[PDB]
């Protein structure tokens, strides 16, 4: 073919990719659905913080994709014990990825799978979003999705109680608890099951109630939870700023319509304050 | 969107002669590809062109009794993807009636439209071996749709801008007391439109603008304050002349629009055959 | 290095669109179906539908191939 392949990368549950000369090769029901989907998805974005999709290409019903080669991604970094995480690193991982979103959600499209490995870094220290098969067209008042969506340990709260309609809140949540295990170096909620994450996510930020989430009696999946009180942000995050603790009670905030959206998060205090982010080609690899 | 969209860069052409060129491209490279493998057999690009409308409106008709309903996005996409396909490609070559099949299953994916291909090839009306040997002429032309695409498969359709028009009309211009009634011949002239080559040729904005301002045209509103005032054209002379041209342009295109014959498809349809009975 | 906020450039080579959040000030809103509570639950408002819909009325609405 027109690919030197090089080197296994790893495999899925839809296709296996490898790197090939430098470039990353994703190779009754016909051609794959989540490939479709990324094909059709990536071919109308076009941003810097989105992972290009450089080629597609099959045979029969078997497809391959062809995308820009990646070194990491934020779960790597995360994980890596020898790499220290300073604010300007984090705010730098958040304004990439909230750059990215923010052209996303301008294009009507919700990621949906927004988790630290889904962020992928290359050589230059710049940030993409990528695994794109369960991003999904938002904006329609009939394109009724599923709530079995995002990963659990970032999937929002109105998601758990079983939203079919929703917004960029979804991946406003994701983006939330990203940037708390980005903080922490641990994943921020890490439920067992679906009760089981909600009864992490009450415990840590307290149940909401109408003050806070007027119609969350509405979601067909609801379900009363004991009243706690909720640790208080600045407890969880003893080495954040209150700019950054505004972020983070701004991405977390119950109601999935008052939770800022990525243009809001963008123009916060937070990133426009010292220190700066950290720029792309200064930023730790693993 | 459509303003950075595939379609957009790719597949809207500057006139119905650069069309005309790529079809005629495609009937001669088939033609000379036929006499190498070795001519009456052989169809002229008019002949594929009224044998390219025939299976669209197959096409319409298969999507229109479509069990589970089929949304009107796919059927758009389904049609835009048909239209595609035979710019560059012969019917000699790819026989029309699979390939309207085939552009309705991958329509059907890409709008996520999820429909089970058993219950896809249910909707034809043939025999269980015939729903299983579409099929399988299905999965074997997908991926080949796919490429003559060129992996472009996100169609933005003129319904969205349509209604976005609506709602537009009965915000900010109140002088059109009800922009409903301009609803139902609007869409008429909307299929219309689809039928003639303007998705391939217009943005669906200008095309759903033109089907609501003949709409309005026919039931004798004449309302240009919306192009001058409410979108602001008339501090741009130029855009509005261009607008203007544009959808004169539209109406030009559908009035002069002909539909083919039954006796001139019958005898193009026992010629195409004749062509797929072998090379 | 700091940081500033830029919105983003994207030319929609058409009429320009009101702001998502002044819809309803702006009458919008009255001519598209209102969320359900349901709907407000998840995040989706009608809004979002209209903001969409005046978008797609009004992309590469004034642009020529
Ligand atoms: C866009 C996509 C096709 C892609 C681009 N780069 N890339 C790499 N690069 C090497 C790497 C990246 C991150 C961390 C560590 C190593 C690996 C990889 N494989 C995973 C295995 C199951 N799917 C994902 N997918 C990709």
Do not use: N
């Given at each position: 073919k027109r690919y030197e392949k090089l080197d296994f990368l790893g495999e899925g549950q839809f296709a296996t990719v490898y790197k090939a000369r430098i470039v990353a090769i994703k190779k009754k029901d016909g051609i794959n659905r989540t490939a479709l989907r990324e094909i059709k998805l990536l071919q109308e974005l076009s941003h810097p913080n989105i992972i290009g999709l450089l080629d597609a290409f099959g045979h029969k019903s078997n497809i391959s994709l062809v995308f820009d080669f990646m070194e990491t991604d934020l779960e790597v970094i995360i994980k890596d014990n020898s790499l220290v995480l300073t604010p300007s690193h984090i705010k730098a991982y958040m304004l990439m990825t909230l750059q990215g979103l923010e052209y996303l959600h301008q294009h009507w499209?919700?990621?949906?799978?927004?988790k630290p490995n889904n962020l992928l870094l290359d050589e230059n220290g710049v940030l993409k979003l990528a695994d794109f098969g369960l991003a999904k067209s938002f904006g329609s008042p009939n394109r009724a999705y599923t709530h079995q969506v995002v990963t659990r340990w970032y999937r929002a709260p109105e998601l758990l109680f079983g939203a079919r309609m929703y917004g960029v809140g979804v991946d406003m949540w994701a983006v939330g608890c990203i940037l708390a295990e980005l903080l922490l170096r641990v994943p921020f909620l890490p439920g067992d099951s679906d009760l089981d994450q909600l009864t992490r996510i009450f415990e840590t930020l307290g149940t909401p109630t109408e003050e806070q989430w007027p119609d969350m009696c509405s979601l067909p999946d609801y379900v009363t939870f004991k009243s706690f009180p909720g640790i208080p942000l600045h407890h969880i995050f003893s080495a954040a700023g209150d700019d950054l603790l505004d972020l983070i009670q701004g991405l977390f905030l119950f109601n999935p319509c008052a939770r800022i959206t990525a243009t809001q998060a963008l123009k916060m205090k937070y990133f426009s304050n010292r220190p700066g982010p950290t720029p792309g080609c200064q930023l730790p690899r693993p | 969107m459509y303003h950075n969209s595939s379609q957009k860069r790719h597949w809207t052409f500057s006139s119905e002669e650069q069309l005309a060129r790529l079809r005629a491209d495609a009937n001669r490279k088939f033609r000379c590809k036929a006499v190498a493998n070795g001519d009456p057999v052989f169809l002229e690009p008019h002949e594929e062109m009224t044998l390219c409308k025939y299976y669209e409106k197959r096409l319409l008709e298969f999507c229109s009794v479509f069990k589970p309903a089929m949304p009107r996005s796919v059927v758009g996409t389904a049609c835009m993807y048909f239209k595609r396909f035979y710019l560059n490609n012969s019917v000699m070559e790819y026989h029309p009636r699979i390939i309207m099949l085939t552009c309705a299953f991958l329509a059907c994916k890409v709008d996520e439209f999820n429909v089970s291909s058993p219950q896809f090839v249910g909707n034809?009306?043939?025999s269980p071996l015939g729903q299983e040997k579409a099929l399988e002429q299905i999965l074997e032309y997908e991926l080949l749709l796919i490429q003559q695409l060129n992996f472009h498969l996100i169609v933005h359709n003129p319904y969205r801008p349509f209604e976005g028009f609506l709602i537009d009309l009965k915000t900010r211009y109140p002088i059109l007391e009800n922009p409903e009634i301009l609803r139902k011949t609007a869409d008429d002239f909307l299929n219309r439109i689809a039928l003639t080559d303007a998705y391939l040729l217009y943005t669906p904005s200008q095309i759903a603008l033109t089907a609501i301002l003949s709409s309005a045209s026919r039931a004798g509103i004449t309302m240009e304050s919306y192009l001058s005032e409410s979108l602001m054209l008339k501090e741009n002379r130029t855009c509005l002349s261009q607008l203007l041209d544009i959808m004169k342009s539209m109406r030009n295109l559908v009035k002069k629009y002909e539909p083919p014959r039954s006796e001139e498809v019958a005898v193009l349809k026992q010629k195409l055959e004749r062509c797929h009975s072998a090379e | 290095a700091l940081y500033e906020y830029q919105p983003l450039q994207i030319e929609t080579y058409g009429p320009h669109v009101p702001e998502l959040e002044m819809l309803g000030r702006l009458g919008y809103l009255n001519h598209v179906r209102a969320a359900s509570p349901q709907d407000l639950a998840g995040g989706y408002t009608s809004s979002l539908a209209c903001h969409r819909a005046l978008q797609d009325a009004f992309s590469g609405l004034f642009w020529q191939p």
């Open positions: 499209i919700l990621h949906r799978d927004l | 034809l009306r043939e | -």
